[PDB]
Design a protein around this nucleic acid. Structure first.
Lengths: 93, 98, 333, 82
DNA sequence: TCGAGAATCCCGGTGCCGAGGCCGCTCAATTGGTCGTAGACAGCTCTAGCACCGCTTAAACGCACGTACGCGCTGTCCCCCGCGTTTTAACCGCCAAGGGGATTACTCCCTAGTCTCCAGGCACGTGTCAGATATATACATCCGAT
DNA sequence: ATCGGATGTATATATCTGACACGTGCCTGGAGACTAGGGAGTAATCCCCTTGGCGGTTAAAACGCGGGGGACAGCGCGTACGTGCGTTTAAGCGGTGCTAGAGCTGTCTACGACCAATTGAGCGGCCTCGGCACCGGGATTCTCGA
């Protein structure tokens, strides 16, 4: 059964931050579960706020607002800046 | 002459090494038997994943050490080093578990 | 609650059929038959040089089977004290037991071998079957009438055979709750009725009714009439026994030299008797027709009776104040 | 195969081990069984809810993802099991 | 308090399997049209908020003061820590059976989607009593002398 | 432990009313009827994880066993806190007035939706080998009696 995960991108960004490091597959699964958790969190919050806004379209403004609702302080600030830079890069082409 | 460390000291080192260690501190089979006993109460002859029951025991023990932790804290506020059941009860009370 | 100085090295005791005499074994290997009424020793028998660890009265009471630690079993007439018969085996004998309805027959539980039923008339022997063939430790007992043989192994397996054919009439394995077996420490029966008890290695006494095992058939799941234990101390039981009627059950905590007393129907603990904290509890027995209990600990026997409200409390004795019921003509002439 | 009394299968040494992990020095006896009770009560919920999932799952075996979604619904989510 | 002893840290060496790397092998990602539409936006209201200001007053701040709980200290009991011993069953390794879990392939029952019509719901008026409020009263309860 | 006095509180009363139950006309979501697809349901198959047992081990649990350590009870004092009474103060009513901004309608349009054609990024599966886990042994450091 074709099962999808992210541990490959985990290894990728690890090498991006720590090239000389290994991981326990256990820890990879833990991190992936964490990925899923934050994803469902942000998605549910975005859908809920759009419902409050009666919006049927979830866009990057919703993304940023919901992250700010979720992440604290500089975590949220850096995340907002990063998402902004990335969407700017993608929209540049 | 025989030597005996002062009280707590050995238990203190036990605390230190347990905060050092990370693995479980509960024997697997007894926990599993307890889980299945609890299960038959709601429905009999139900099977389980070893991963599932490992998760059960890990999450339990986590909740349990958290309870022990904040009850320790409360007993600090109780100015005692011995624990009292009322500490646990009222901790659950603050934990909304009442 | 009353001991006896006249006997020493008390190791094992056994009430007669009517609870009038008590044959106690001693470390010297002597039988001391002591009387309850005269409160004195009735007989001394040179049984063995080896201490006696198993003693049983005959139904008529005129025969006693004794087992030495020398693997020497011997029958003795209580009036004379002669060794009527004598046999020896391998795997030293753990227990002897007269057949309750045929004193010619006697079952013997050895240490490592299967229990064997012998007769006194003919020096023959019938080896009783073993379920797992590797128990090496099976206790066995006649029922109240001697019609069936209950054999329990170190692996919790329980076989009910018929005393004549040794055919498997019932079977079941007791559980430690979850899935495990437990060493069957002992099987006891009631001299009245059909309720019997099992002492096991789990320190939990299990009370059943043999009819329910018979109707349960071979390899069934019979539940106990009762489950009895020290939920407070989790104490083993060196020796237990019913009451004479069969509605009270006692257990001997050799760990702390105490005696627990529960009921049968409800099963609630009647009471607890505390002995000398320094004494090691060894043997326990109940008077068959009296609330009297004999205990053997550190070679010393103690007696535990139970008296009624009288012996000083018998005007008309009352317990609580009584409001006088005044009559209609209470003040009339 | 009817089970029972595995709650006391929890050893007092195990309890005190967990306590030392929690950083506790002196403990009373009255706790352990009390502790056990709580333990039971705690798990009292999840398994049921878990098998509730398995209830809707129409299956005879119980899986981890059950307790995952339970602890989630119990606000005590856990990682490392999908 | 300077040693003895004990639990621990660290070092080298052994052996291993998970971490990882690579390999077939897709289906899910991309690309590109195409379309109906979510909302972006403009452009109106209007109203609820926002501030203004005055008037009354219940409320707030501080005082003094009793006082009584917080706190600090002592001695006791008992009791839980530490260690020693004895017992056991968790574990671990292996085996085995099957029963359920997952899979795929059909098959079709039910729901989404459409269109019609109207009737229950909703905004909107409308008398109107449950209860808010005030007052005098009768009952309960504290606090201090006896 | 009681009684007397103070005080605070539950009660009946009266009326005021403004929420509130009630009724409307008008609107549109709900019902009713019809069509399609395809998620769901069923079944046969495979696998294979689980649940069961069996034997040996010991680390671990049970249990016992002092015994110093603190839980706890009590006991003195004192400082901080209730309290009732002062004081002054913003809080609330209320009513005024402006509008900034919600809050509504009407476009029109970019924007995914969606489908179709294409495929390589990714995933199950297969070696592989090296940090890592274990072990044994030596050296270090805490601790409890001087």
């Amino acid at each position: 059964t074709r099962k999808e995960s992210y541990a490959i991108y985990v290894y990728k960004v690890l090498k991006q931050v720590h090239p000389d490091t290994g991981i326990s597959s256990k820890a990879m699964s833990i991190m992936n579960s964490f990925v899923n958790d934050v994803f469902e969190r942000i998605a549910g919050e975005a859908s809920r706020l759009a419902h409050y806004n009666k919006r049927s379209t979830i866009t990057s403004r919703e993304i940023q607002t919901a992250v700010r609702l979720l992440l604290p302080g500089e975590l949220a600030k850096h995340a907002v800046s990063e998402g902004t830079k990335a969407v700017t890069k993608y929209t540049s082409a | 002459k025989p030597h005996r460390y002062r009280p707590g000291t050995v238990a203190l080192r036990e605390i230190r090494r347990y905060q050092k260690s990370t693995e479980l501190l509960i024997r697997k089979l007894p926990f599993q038997r307890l889980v299945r006993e609890i299960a038959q109460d709601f429905k009999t002859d139900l099977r389980f994943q070893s991963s599932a029951v490992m998760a059960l025991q890990e999450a339990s023990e986590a909740y349990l050490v958290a309870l022990f932790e904040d009850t320790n804290l409360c007993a600090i506020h109780a100015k005692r080093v011995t624990i009292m059941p009322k500490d646990i009860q009222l901790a659950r009370r603050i934990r909304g578990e009442r | 609650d009353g001991t006896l100085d006249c006997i020493s090295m008390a190791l094992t005791c056994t009430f007669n059929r009517w609870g009038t005499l008590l044959a106690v074994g001693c470390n010297d290997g002597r039988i001391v038959i002591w009387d309850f009424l005269t409160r004195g020793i009735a007989k001394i028998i040179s049984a063995h040089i080896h201490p006696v660890c198993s003693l049983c009265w005959s139904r008529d009471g005129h025969k006693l089977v004794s087992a030495s630690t020398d693997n020497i079993v011997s029958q003795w007439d209580v009036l004379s004290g002669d060794c009527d018969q004598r046999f020896r085996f391998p795997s030293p004998i753990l227990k002897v037991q007269y057949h309750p309805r045929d004193q010619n027959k006697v079952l013997v539980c050895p240490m490592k071998s299967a229990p064997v039923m012998l007769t006194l008339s003919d020096s023959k022997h019938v080896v009783l079957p073993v379920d797992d063939d590797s128990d090496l430790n099976v206790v066995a007992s006649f029922d109240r009438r001697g019609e069936y043989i209950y054999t329990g192994n170190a692996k919790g397996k329980i076989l009910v055979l018929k005393t004549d054919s040794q055919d498997l009439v019932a079977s079941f394995r007791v559980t430690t709750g979850t899935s495990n077996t437990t060493a069957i420490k002992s099987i006891e029966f009631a001299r009245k009725g059909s309720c019997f008890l099992i002492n096991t290695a789990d320190r939990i006494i299990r009370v059943y009714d043999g009819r329910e095992i018979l109707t349960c058939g071979r390899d069934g799941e019979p539940e106990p009439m009762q489950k009895l234990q020290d939920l407070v101390n989790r104490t083993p039981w060196k020796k237990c026994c019913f009451s004479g009627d069969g509605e009270y059950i006692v257990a001997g905590s050799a760990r702390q030299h105490a005696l627990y007393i529960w009921e049968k129907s409800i099963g609630n603990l009647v009471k607890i008797l505390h002995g000398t904290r320094g004494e090691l509890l060894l043997d326990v027995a109940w008077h068959p027709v009296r609330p009297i209990i004999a205990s053997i600990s550190s070679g010393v026997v103690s007696i535990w009776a139970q008296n009624q409200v009288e012996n000083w409390s018998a005007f008309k004795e009352l317990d609580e104040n009584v409001e006088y019921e005044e009559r209609e003509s209470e003040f009339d002439i | 195969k009817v089970l029972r009394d595995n709650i006391q299968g929890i050893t007092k040494p195990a309890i005190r081990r967990l306590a030392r992990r929690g950083g506790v020095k002196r403990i009373s006896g009255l706790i352990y069984e009390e502790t056990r009770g709580v333990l039971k009560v705690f798990l009292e919920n999840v398994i049921r809810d878990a098998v509730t999932y398995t209830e809707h799952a129409k299956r005879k075996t119980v899986t981890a993802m059950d307790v995952v979604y339970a602890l989630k619904r119990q606000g005590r989510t856990l990682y490392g099991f999908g």
